[PDB]
Structure 1
Amino acid sequence: KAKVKATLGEFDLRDYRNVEVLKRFLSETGKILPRRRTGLSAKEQRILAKTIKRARILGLLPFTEKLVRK
Structure 2
Amino acid sequence: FFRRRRFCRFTAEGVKEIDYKDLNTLKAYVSETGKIVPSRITGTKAKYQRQLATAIKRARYLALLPYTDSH
Match of 1:33 among 37, 41, 46: 37
Query: Does the alignment pair 1:2 with 2:2?
Result: yes
TM-score by length of 2: 0.72
Letter of the 1:26 partner, please give it.
Answer: V
For structure 2, which runs of at least 5 residues remain unmatched after alignment? none
Identity of aligned residues (%): 47
Larger helix percent: 2
For structure 1, which runs of at least 5 residues remain unmatched after alignment? none
SS in 1 for 2:52: helix
> Could you say which residue in structure 1 is the equivalent of 2:53?
49
> Could you say which residue in structure 1 is the equivalent of 2:23?
19
Match of 2:65 among 37, 44, 61: 61
| Alignment partners' CA distance in 1, 2:19 and 2:7 | 19
Show CA shifts across 1:28-51 (max 9, x none). 111110001222111110000011
Letter of the 2:6 partner, please give it.
Answer: K
Structural RMSD (CA): 2.6
Change (3 A) 1:18 1:31: same
Residues paired across the two proteins, number: 66
